[PDB]
Amino acid sequence: CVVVEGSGRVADVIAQVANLPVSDITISLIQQKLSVFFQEMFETFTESRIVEWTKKIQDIVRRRQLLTVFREGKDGQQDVDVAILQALL
Amino acid sequence: GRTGLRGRGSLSCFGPNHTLYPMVTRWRRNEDGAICRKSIKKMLEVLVVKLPLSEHWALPGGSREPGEMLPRKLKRILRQEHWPSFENL
Ligand SMILES: Nc1ncnc2c1ncn2[C@@H]1O[C@H](COP(=O)(O)OP(=O)(O)OC[C@H]2O[C@@H](O)[C@H](O)[C@@H]2O)[C@@H](O)[C@H]1O
């Protein structure tokens, strides 16, 4: 799975927690980064939704092999192709 | 330390002139009634006064020349007359 940086809500909150160690995720940090990007519906979040999304983001960023960020390099803004090839390999 | 002016000035007496500054605080709710949120912390509301020749908002705090009605010395005309003593209780 390749995520694209500078795109939207869920993309940015996955892309920020890419290179982080797996134990360094705090459930406080999740809702902190969540409510700024979800600032339209940030107040619509409950604690059970926060712990579910924290568990899911944890179990995703565990498997570091199967994920890549596009990084939105934005100096050439080359293609999706350069990302998709490394995410294949 | 030193201030640069000898004397009493516009103060009542020498030394300290004792006064009480009360503050009222409450939370700031959204359209739903939940707490509005900052980046991390929350939003707070205080009740302030503006005098016609002060050109400034300030706390309703009075000189502690009377004992218990020093908030009333700030807020007899502001708060109430009889219910003011109840809120002072
Ligand atoms: N900590 C302070 N910070 C800023 N200004 C101050 C402070 N303390 C006093 N002042 C200013 O000093 C001036 C004289 O002080 P007082 O008159 O003793 O203060 P107070 O009794 O709280 O204000 C009386 C108010 O009634 C009006 O007639 C007059 O315009 C004044 O705003 C006031 O205009 C007040 O704005």
From Swiss-Prot, chain A:
Localization annotation: Cell membrane; Perikaryon; Cell projection; Cytoplasmic vesicle
Domain of life: Eukaryota
Span within the parent record: 350 to 438 of 1503
Protein's name according to its UniProt entry: Transient receptor potential cation channel subfamily M member 2
Lineage: Eukaryota, Metazoa, Chordata, Craniata, Vertebrata
Family, per entry: Belongs to the transient receptor (TC 1.A.4) family. LTrpC subfamily. TRPM2 sub-subfamily.
UniProt domain comment: Contains two binding sites for ADP-ribose, one in the N-terminal part of the channel and the other in the C-terminal nudix hydrolase domain. Both sites seem to have a role in channel opening, but the interaction of ADP-ribose with the N-terminal site is absolutely required for channel activation.
Subunit note: Homotetramer. Isoform 1 can interact with isoform 3. This interaction decreases Ca(2+) influx through isoform 1 and suppresses susceptibility to oxidative stress-induced cell death.
Expressing tissues: Highly expressed in brain and peripheral blood cells, such as neutrophils. Also detected in bone marrow, spleen, heart, liver and lung. Isoform 2 is found in neutrophil granulocytes.
Species this protein is from: Homo sapiens
